[PDB]
Every structure is written in structure tokens, then in C-alpha cells.
């Protein structure tokens, strides 16, 4: 069918890992920042709301 | 604008602060809601929890993106209504991020 | 092995032949709480056939403790991650319960020193009571949240401290400290 | 030194070649095509649409014969009749020399017969001053016969069961072509591969890279849309 | 092997302290292979020899302190890999007898942090 090279490509699939394994390390505490501060705005929202409703 | 709720509370959108002439007409006031927002040229579209749009998804699925003039749940009726605390907290955590 | 790989002969042969693999993690090590054994990456297929001979000679409820208690780590592994990111106080009282017990498992039943020889000497009778107390403290934790007992005062009980002083004696003071320590749990959830 | 820069372009009947690569006399265009993608079939399309350009090059090129050569290294029953029936459809059958090989015809002569035929090309192309188009198609079945000597004998497999004398085996074949500086004839050879899958470490895509300058690839992605 | 045998006599028997700094192990290991291939020893994984181990030991094991002899040789070998990947012998081998590894960052060396 269609299949990729197996010694040219050897060099790229080792480098797959360097990009992947390191890549997903930082992916974790990234999104955590935005979602962390988000909470603040949700709580704080109802502050004036309840009062003025 | 275009804000509508119960009759008594609809009165004051008829004045200033807010613009409006409707009230209820359906479950979520579809008769007015859909037809109106199609143009979307109104200064604000706010649908109160006096109608209660259970499928806020109907408008989003149809609009296919627009934060400009789209319902904002408030309350629209008085029973010492300040319950949009305990409601909004659970409405956010359940579908977006980790549950309560 | 050079990577940690299984596609090398030596590993994928041993792997079936010998029935247990004891992986220690680098992170688990660096904080100074020994052993540093990473559980999801360890296993012992031996345990099955030994469960008869364990309870027979050692203690009757000994197997009953091990298997049961391990559920702590499992519901704690996927809990720490990013679900208690917002503090445990903004979560359910059943998902709190996990870190309340969590204290005793991590400061008592996993903390040890290779620098102190009065805690590193361990035997059946010492380890057995430690794992035991954490069963009897979950049984009382969960009765605490069914009565709506605050998580401020349960984390400040004398009960937790009573475990801590009984890992600083090898096995001599252990019997007398189990007389007092057990019954102390009993009257500190009943003192509240 | 006897070779001199190619520049006399022909119509292959696909705008795509005559722009992007702009195939000219004396030049090779290997048609990279994996397995599970036809290339014997679609090659016949080029083979019948081929026609010189004489009004744009400032001189006649129809004045000196445009004969063509074809030659298979190994083909089936259906593709045998399919070829002739696509040469009978335009009458491009006339003025051709066909040194076909089949899969039931000697397996030793899949690699002997190319070498033979190419020295019957040199005679009508260079010494009778004809523009001869050579098209050699089915270059795996080549490699089948090549394999046999590669390893069974004294010769060793220097890459992928084929001899280590591989370099020569792909040199006398491929080298034939190039515009002469003292003849006005030429051998324009267009190899059409059936190289294994989309691999580039396989002997075929290998050496072929370095060799040609101009090259074109066909793929299977647009081939299932049905575009040709 | 030359300066190896001289070194023994430098740091243990003069009480001096030597620091052996080797560089480029790739060449050391290529040349080796040719020698062994004629003694009827088969080359190893990713062509690099398997009789490497023994021979590589003998250079590195004249390192470590010695009882009563204060002076001893400190070993620092330096070797090359395509991107510091562990998918051939050159690191594996080494990495059993020697302790630690100290790899090089692309970010750093670009910015000229040495």
C-alpha cells in the first residue's frame, strides 16, 4: 500500500520523542494557569449580583 | 434592547434602562427569541430565568458563534431571588473543568 | 537495562519467569520518605498463593488490611493531578476524606529514615498495627463526615501524633503504645 | 564531453510536465509510483500524446523520424493485449520496436534483454540521426532477475538481496541518453518505476534520486479521486 | 595504552594527581572494529563492536582511589552521539562502568552560555 522509509525515518522517530516527551511536560501546568485564575471571576461574579438583584 | 420576562417586570423595559415590549409566549419564549435574534441588531438580548432557557444550546447551535447580543440569565422574578449563586457555581464546574 | 526497554532479551525473559518487579521512582525518592516504591510500576504475582500462608502464621486480619488499604493510593493518584488544584475545601466531603486518611499513610506508613536505626528496624508486629490504625481511622473519618464533623479539628487530633511517636521506637515501646494509641482514635472522634 | 545541454522540448500532452519539469530531448523523467498505483496503464497515455514541437523551436523535428521503442521486463496477460490495443487506438503502433518480456518468458532475460535492446537504439538513434524515445517500464521485475545472481552465487547481497555490483547494473541501463554535440539524433529514455510502496531507502528511489535532475511523482491520494 | 601505563607510575607512585581527558570515542571504536573483524570476532549492535566492553574497561578502571596512595587519576571521557540518543552501543556500554551523564542543550549553546 503506502509505507514510510525505515532508516531515513529512523532519525525522525527518535526525534519524535524529544518533541513529544518534553512537549507534553509543559502542556500540563500551562492550561492550569488560565483555569486557576478563572475560578476567581466565577466566585467574585455573584458579589454585586445578589445585592442588586 | 429586547428583554422580556413576566408582565410586571416587562413594564420597566418598556420605560428606559432597558428596551423591550414582549413577555412570555412559550417555554423559553421561542416565538420572539429566535425571530428577533436572527437580525441581531439590538443593543442587547437577555433572556431571564423567568422564561428559563434549558437549551441554551438551541441559540448557539444556530448562531454558530456570536457573543454580541445573546442571552444572559438573570432572574426576572422575585422570590428574594439571589439564588444565581448556588446555580452558577454548579452550572460552570459541571460541564467546563472538574465537577463539584 | 540501558533504557528501561523490554525489546532487550534479559528483561522480556525475566519478566514471566520471575514473578515480581519492584520499580522505585526518582521523584518518590527525592523528598526523604523511604521506601520510594512506585506502586503502579510494581507488581508481585506471588501474593495470590501466599494469601493462605500469610493469614495462617502472621495474623488473621493481616491480608484483609493490605488489599483494602491500597485503594487509598489509587483514589489519591488521580485526585492530586488537577482535580484538587482549587484546594480540597471546594470539593465534596467524600473526596476530602481521601487526604484526611492521606496524612497518616504518608507521615506514618511510608515515612522512614536510613539515617535513624530506631525506625528502620521494623518487624511484623509494628508494621501490622500501623496499617491497622489507618483502617480504624477511615472507619471513624467516614463516620465523621456522616455526622458533619469539621475537617479543621479532625486534622488537629492528638490521634495523628500518637501514631508518629510509635515509629520512633523499634518494637519495644510499640506494644504499650498500641494499648494507648488504638483506644485514643476511639475517644477523639467521640470527644468531638 | 560529447554530451551537450538538453533544450529541445516536446509535448507529452499533460501541461503539468511541459511547465513544471518541461521534458526535453535527451532527458529522463522517472515517474515515481508506489505499489498499489498503476503506471503501465497511465504511461500509455503519455506514449500516445507524445509529439515534437517544430514551430516553436525555429526548425523541423518531424523531418527526422520520431520513432519510439517500448520494452517490458515482465508483464501479465491482460497488460500484454492492453498495451497493443492502446497503440492501435491512435496508430502510434507504427514505427516502433517492442522488445517485450513476459513473466513466463526466461527469468534470466529480464536483465539481459534491456542491455541488448539499448545497443540497437544507438544505431538508429545516433548513426541514422533519429529522435528515439525509449520507454522501459516494469523495473521490479528487472530486480527479480537481478536478485537471483545477487546472493545464490559468489556475489554478495550489498543491499536488500540484490548484488553489491548493483551500481553497474543500474549504470549501463540508465546512462543511455543525452543530446549529442556531433549527431542530431538523440536517445531520450524515460524509465517508469513501480518502486515498493512510498519507501526512499529501497535501492530503486535511492540511486534514481541522484541520477536524474528532472523527475515527477504520481501518488495514490488523487488517484482514488479518479484524476489522471 | 602508552600514557596509560605511564600514568600509573605518575599519580600512584609519585603521589601526583592526574586528570585524564579523552576526546572523540567514535574514532577509537571505528578503528577497533577493523582489527577484531580479522580475529574472527563478529561486530556488534548498530555495527559497533561487542568486544568493546573489555577493552574500554581497561582505560577507565585505572581510576578510583587506592589505599595508602593519596594520588590517583581522575577519568573524564568525552564521546559524541547524534543528539545524545541511547539507540546504539557508544553510550550504553560506557554508562555501566562510568557514573553519571552530562548532556548539552541546544538552547544554551545558541545563546552562548558555556
Coordinates of N, CA and C in Angstrom, one line a residue, chain E residues 3-101:
Chain E
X3 N 50.5 6.1 27.4 CA 50.4 7.1 28.5 C 49.5 6.5 29.7
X4 N 48.8 5.4 29.4 CA 48.0 4.7 30.4 C 49.0 4.1 31.5
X5 N 49.9 3.3 31.0 CA 50.9 2.6 31.8 C 51.9 3.5 32.5
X6 N 52.1 4.8 31.8 CA 53.0 5.8 32.4 C 52.3 6.6 33.5
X7 N 51.0 6.7 33.4 CA 50.1 7.3 34.3 C 50.0 6.7 35.6
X8 N 50.1 5.4 35.6 CA 50.0 4.5 36.8 C 51.1 5.0 37.8
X9 N 52.4 5.1 37.3 CA 53.6 5.5 37.8 C 53.6 7.0 38.1
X10 N 52.6 7.8 37.5 CA 52.6 9.2 37.8 C 51.8 9.4 39.1
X11 N 50.5 9.2 39.1 CA 49.7 9.5 40.2 C 49.7 8.6 41.4
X12 N 50.0 7.2 41.3 CA 50.1 6.4 42.5 C 51.4 6.3 43.0
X13 N 52.5 6.4 42.2 CA 53.8 6.1 42.7 C 54.6 7.5 42.9
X14 N 54.2 8.7 42.4 CA 54.8 9.9 42.7 C 54.0 10.7 43.6
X15 N 52.7 10.2 43.9 CA 51.8 10.9 44.7 C 51.3 12.1 44.0
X16 N 51.3 12.2 42.7 CA 50.8 13.3 41.9 C 49.3 13.1 41.7
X17 N 48.6 14.1 41.1 CA 47.2 13.8 40.9 C 47.0 14.2 39.4
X18 N 46.5 13.2 38.5 CA 46.4 13.4 37.1 C 45.0 13.5 36.8
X19 N 44.6 14.1 35.6 CA 43.3 14.2 35.2 C 43.4 13.8 33.7
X20 N 42.8 12.7 33.3 CA 42.8 12.2 32.0 C 41.6 12.7 31.4
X21 N 41.7 13.3 30.1 CA 40.7 13.9 29.4 C 40.9 13.3 28.1
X22 N 40.0 12.4 27.7 CA 39.9 11.8 26.4 C 39.0 12.6 25.6
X23 N 39.1 12.6 24.2 CA 38.1 13.2 23.4 C 37.9 12.5 22.1
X24 N 36.6 12.4 21.6 CA 36.2 11.6 20.4 C 36.4 10.1 20.5
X25 N 35.3 9.3 21.0 CA 35.4 8.0 21.2 C 34.9 7.2 20.0
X26 N 34.0 8.0 19.2 CA 33.6 7.4 17.9 C 34.8 6.8 17.1
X27 N 36.0 7.5 16.9 CA 37.1 7.1 16.1 C 37.8 5.9 16.7
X28 N 38.0 5.9 18.0 CA 38.6 4.8 18.9 C 37.9 3.5 18.7
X29 N 36.6 3.5 18.3 CA 35.7 2.4 18.4 C 35.5 1.9 16.9
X30 N 35.5 2.9 15.9 CA 35.6 2.5 14.5 C 36.8 1.7 14.1
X31 N 38.0 2.3 14.3 CA 39.3 1.6 14.1 C 39.3 0.3 14.7
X32 N 38.8 0.1 16.0 CA 38.9 -1.1 16.8 C 38.3 -2.3 16.1
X33 N 37.0 -2.1 15.7 CA 36.2 -2.9 14.8 C 36.9 -3.7 13.6
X34 N 37.8 -3.0 12.8 CA 38.5 -3.5 11.7 C 39.5 -4.6 12.1
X35 N 40.1 -4.4 13.3 CA 41.1 -5.2 14.0 C 40.5 -6.6 14.4
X36 N 39.3 -6.5 14.9 CA 38.5 -7.7 15.6 C 37.9 -8.5 14.6
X37 N 37.4 -7.8 13.5 CA 36.8 -8.5 12.4 C 37.7 -9.4 11.6
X38 N 39.1 -9.4 11.9 CA 40.0 -10.3 11.3 C 40.5 -11.3 12.2
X39 N 40.1 -11.3 13.6 CA 40.5 -12.2 14.6 C 39.4 -13.2 14.8
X40 N 38.3 -13.0 13.9 CA 37.1 -13.8 13.9 C 36.2 -13.5 15.0
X41 N 36.0 -12.2 15.2 CA 35.1 -11.7 16.2 C 34.1 -10.9 15.4
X42 N 32.8 -11.2 15.6 CA 31.7 -10.6 14.9 C 31.4 -9.3 15.4
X43 N 31.3 -8.2 14.7 CA 30.8 -7.0 15.2 C 29.4 -7.0 15.8
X44 N 29.1 -5.9 16.5 CA 28.0 -5.8 17.5 C 26.8 -5.1 17.1
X45 N 26.0 -4.5 18.0 CA 24.8 -3.9 17.7 C 25.0 -2.4 17.1
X46 N 24.3 -2.2 15.9 CA 24.4 -1.0 15.1 C 25.8 -0.7 14.7
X47 N 26.5 -1.9 14.3 CA 27.7 -2.2 13.7 C 28.9 -2.1 14.6
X48 N 28.8 -1.3 15.7 CA 29.8 -1.1 16.6 C 30.1 -2.3 17.4
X49 N 31.4 -2.8 17.6 CA 31.7 -4.0 18.2 C 31.3 -4.3 19.5
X50 N 31.2 -5.6 19.8 CA 30.7 -6.2 21.1 C 31.8 -6.6 22.0
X51 N 33.0 -6.7 21.5 CA 34.3 -7.0 22.2 C 34.8 -5.6 22.7
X52 N 34.1 -4.5 22.6 CA 34.3 -3.2 23.0 C 34.5 -3.1 24.5
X53 N 33.5 -3.6 25.2 CA 33.3 -3.7 26.6 C 34.6 -3.9 27.4
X54 N 35.3 -5.0 27.1 CA 36.5 -5.4 27.8 C 37.6 -4.4 27.7
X55 N 38.0 -4.1 26.5 CA 38.9 -3.1 26.0 C 38.7 -1.7 26.5
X56 N 37.5 -1.2 26.7 CA 37.0 0.1 27.1 C 37.2 0.2 28.6
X57 N 36.9 -0.9 29.3 CA 37.1 -1.1 30.8 C 38.5 -0.7 31.2
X58 N 39.5 -1.5 30.6 CA 40.9 -1.3 30.9 C 41.5 0.1 30.8
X59 N 40.8 1.2 30.4 CA 41.3 2.5 30.3 C 40.7 3.3 31.5
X60 N 39.5 3.0 31.8 CA 38.6 3.6 32.8 C 38.8 3.1 34.3
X61 N 39.4 1.9 34.4 CA 39.5 1.2 35.7 C 40.8 1.4 36.3
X62 N 41.5 2.5 35.8 CA 42.7 2.8 36.4 C 42.4 4.2 37.1
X63 N 41.2 4.2 37.5 CA 40.5 5.4 38.1 C 39.9 4.8 39.4
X64 N 39.8 5.6 40.4 CA 39.4 5.2 41.8 C 40.6 5.3 42.6
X65 N 40.3 5.6 43.9 CA 41.5 5.9 44.8 C 42.0 4.5 45.2
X66 N 43.2 4.5 45.9 CA 44.0 3.4 46.2 C 44.4 3.6 47.7
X67 N 44.4 2.5 48.5 CA 44.7 2.5 49.9 C 46.1 2.9 50.1
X68 N 46.3 4.0 51.0 CA 47.6 4.5 51.3 C 48.3 5.3 50.3
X69 N 47.8 5.3 49.0 CA 48.4 6.2 48.0 C 47.2 7.1 47.7
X70 N 47.5 8.4 48.2 CA 46.8 9.6 48.0 C 46.5 10.1 46.6
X71 N 47.5 9.9 45.7 CA 47.4 10.4 44.4 C 46.7 9.3 43.6
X72 N 45.8 9.6 42.7 CA 45.1 8.6 41.9 C 44.6 9.5 40.7
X73 N 44.3 8.9 39.6 CA 43.9 9.5 38.3 C 42.4 9.8 38.3
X74 N 41.9 11.0 37.9 CA 40.5 11.2 37.8 C 40.3 11.1 36.2
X75 N 39.2 10.3 35.9 CA 38.8 10.0 34.5 C 37.6 10.8 34.1
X76 N 37.7 11.4 32.9 CA 36.7 12.3 32.2 C 36.8 11.8 30.8
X77 N 35.9 11.1 30.4 CA 35.9 10.7 28.9 C 34.9 11.6 28.3
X78 N 35.1 11.9 27.0 CA 34.1 12.7 26.3 C 33.8 11.9 25.0
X79 N 32.6 11.8 24.5 CA 32.2 10.9 23.4 C 31.1 11.7 22.7
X80 N 30.6 11.3 21.5 CA 29.7 12.0 20.6 C 28.6 11.0 20.3
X81 N 27.5 11.6 20.0 CA 26.3 10.8 19.7 C 25.6 11.7 18.8
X82 N 24.6 11.3 18.0 CA 23.9 12.2 17.0 C 23.1 13.3 17.8
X83 N 22.4 13.1 18.9 CA 21.6 14.1 19.6 C 21.6 13.6 21.1
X84 N 22.5 12.7 21.4 CA 22.6 12.2 22.8 C 21.6 11.1 22.9
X85 N 21.3 10.3 21.8 CA 20.3 9.3 21.8 C 21.1 8.0 22.2
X86 N 20.3 7.1 22.9 CA 20.9 6.0 23.5 C 20.6 4.7 22.7
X87 N 20.4 5.0 21.3 CA 20.0 3.9 20.5 C 21.1 3.1 19.7
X88 N 22.3 3.2 20.3 CA 23.4 2.5 19.7 C 24.4 2.2 21.0
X89 N 25.4 1.4 20.9 CA 26.3 0.9 22.0 C 27.0 2.1 22.7
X90 N 27.6 3.1 22.0 CA 28.5 4.0 22.5 C 28.2 4.6 23.8
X91 N 26.9 4.8 24.2 CA 26.6 5.4 25.5 C 26.3 4.3 26.5
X92 N 25.5 3.2 26.1 CA 25.1 2.1 26.9 C 26.2 1.5 27.7
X93 N 27.3 1.0 26.9 CA 28.5 0.4 27.4 C 29.2 1.1 28.4
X94 N 29.6 2.4 28.0 CA 30.2 3.4 28.8 C 29.4 3.6 30.1
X95 N 28.2 3.9 30.1 CA 27.1 4.1 31.1 C 26.9 3.0 32.1
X96 N 27.7 2.0 32.2 CA 27.6 0.9 33.1 C 28.7 1.0 34.0
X97 N 30.0 1.4 33.5 CA 31.2 1.4 34.2 C 31.4 2.8 34.8
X98 N 31.0 3.7 34.0 CA 31.1 5.1 34.4 C 29.8 5.5 35.0
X99 N 29.8 6.6 35.8 CA 28.7 7.0 36.7 C 28.3 8.4 36.3
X100 N 26.9 8.6 36.2 CA 26.5 9.9 35.7 C 26.6 10.2 34.2
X101 N 26.0 11.3 33.8 CA 26.0 11.8 32.4 C 25.6 13.3 32.6

